[PDB]
């Protein structure tokens, strides 16, 4: 009785997993392989909800339901930005884009790809959107600077990346007024490279700055001029640029990708795949 | 034999009776501690 006994196996498993996370003298797997007033007002509503007999009746009748849409909007306002950072960091955007610099987003950036005019394809964090679905520029809803990247879409150099379209001196929310430094190009992910992560970055602009260096010919179909580095570009403008918004999706190869490489990029489709007696008696076993 | 309506009515107050006892025990346990 003196020894403590967890009343469920998982509690020991969770405790053991938590114990394994911390380093220990004994060998473990990881070592080898590794405001207030608002709340008071909120609480008053909670007591009212508990008091409501109808809610209690549903609970005992196990028929109660909750509206997902209402919860979703509230969640974004309260702690949504913090979760936004986790997804970006988990996908390695910060390490690849800013060389390890980490920023908590503050602007709830949202992007969706317009399917003609009837509907527009969402762009979640870590979303999956086919290149066929990216033939057009997406709608962004959130001065400012708006930038598009294919983090791993570069075909020749690992560190380098290409811009889809870059807008500068964006006034407030409207994006039509931004300078079209880079014309829009549809995604061109190489076949057999799996999922390419594309990150959409929003930077706060303290003062309007003309990015004549970042201006590119419209239309431009050359990869040699599309290649760029986010880190040095951000460093050159780090004084007036503080990132606050994010949105990124993953895309596979698709039939449109063949069209993009050939019709306008005008180059071969890139294809890759990960690759996993006397004299002779002495030579042979017999001797 | 209780009717289904009676069980529903009793079920609601049985929760209150459980609540009334539960509150008493907390006070009773604290009362013993004092």
């Amino acid at each position: 009785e003196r020894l403590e006994k967890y009343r469920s196996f998982e509690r020991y498993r969770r405790r053991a997993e938590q114990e394994a996370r911390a380093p220990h003298w004994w060998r473990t797997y990881r070592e080898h392989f590794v405001r207030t007033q608002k709340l008071l007002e909120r609480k008053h509503f909670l007591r009212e909800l508990r008091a409501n007999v109808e809610e209690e009746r549903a609970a005992r009748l196990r028929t109660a339901s909750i509206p997902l849409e209402a919860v979703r909007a509230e969640w974004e306002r309260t702690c949504g930005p913090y979760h936004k950072q986790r997804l970006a960091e988990y996908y390695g955007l910060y390490r690849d884009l800013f060389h390890g610099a980490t920023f908590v987003p503050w602007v709830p950036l949202h992007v969706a790809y317009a399917v003609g005019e009837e509907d527009l394809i969402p762009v979640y964090h870590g979303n999956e959107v086919t290149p066929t679905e990216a033939s057009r520029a997406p709608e962004v809803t959130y001065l400012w600077t708006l930038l598009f990247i294919n983090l791993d879409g570069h075909l020749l150099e690992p560190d380098a990346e290409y811009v889809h379209w870059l807008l500068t001196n964006i006034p407030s929310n409207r994006v039509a007024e931004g300078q079209e430094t880079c014309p829009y190009l549809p995604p061109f992910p190489a076949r057999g490279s799996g999922f390419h992560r594309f990150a959409f970055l929003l930077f706060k602009q303290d003062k309007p700055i003309n990015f004549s260096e970042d201006t590119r010919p419209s239309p431009c179909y050359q990869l040699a001029q599309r290649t760029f580095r986010t880190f040095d570009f951000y460093k050159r403008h780090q004084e007036a640029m503080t990132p606050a918004g994010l949105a990124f999706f993953q895309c596979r190869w698709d039939d449109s990708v063949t069209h993009t490489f050939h019709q306008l990029l005008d180059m071969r489709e890139p294809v890759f795949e990960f690759v996993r007696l006397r004299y002779l008696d002495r030579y042979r076993d017999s001797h | 034999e209780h009717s289904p309506e009676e069980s529903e009515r009793r079920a609601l107050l049985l929760k209150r009776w459980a609540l009334f006892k539960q509150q008493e025990h907390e006070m009773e346990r604290d009362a013993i501690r004092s």
């Binding site: 339901s65 983090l151 490279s193 | -």
Partner: protein, 141 residues
């Protein structure tokens, strides 16, 4: 055409490139311990005394999707944090957060008593209807 030049090998850097493709390595160790580690993501469901929480954790130990009833948005519309419906709601909320995160596949390993729980079963029913798969794809060798 000069553009036709293409490099011999790609330089994909996405952490989930292999994982989403299915070629990423799955933990094949821990042969002396139960259960299996052949899962990229796992659903961790923790029921506290007053709150019910469900998390999705990758092999690296970083939760990507975290659903908790203590969160303000869900609870204000949720009558009692501890309830069978709460497990259903958190499952749908966890699914919606799973929808938010872009993760479609996860491995769930309920315990004998947890599996028997109707609330967890309904929570799984909420997950399956929302599309979140309780079984992950097999690794590609």
């Amino acid at each position: 055409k000069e553009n036709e030049a293409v490099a011999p090998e790609f330089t994909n850097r996405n952490p989930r490139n292999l994982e989403l493709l299915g070629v990423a390595r799955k933990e094949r160790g821990w042969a002396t311990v139960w259960p299996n580690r052949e899962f990229w993501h796992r659903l961790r469901v923790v029921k506290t005394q007053h709150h019910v929480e469900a998390f999705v954790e990758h092999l690296n130990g970083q939760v990507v999707v975290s659903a908790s009833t203590r969160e303000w948005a869900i609870k204000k519309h949720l009558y009692s944090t501890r309830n069978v419906v709460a497990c259903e709601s958190i499952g749908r909320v966890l699914a919606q957060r799973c929808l938010e995160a872009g993760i479609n596949f996860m491995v769930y390993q309920p315990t004998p008593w947890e599996a028997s729980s109707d609330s967890i079963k309904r929570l799984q029913n909420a997950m399956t209807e929302s599309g979140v798969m309780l079984r992950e794809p097999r690794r590609i060798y």
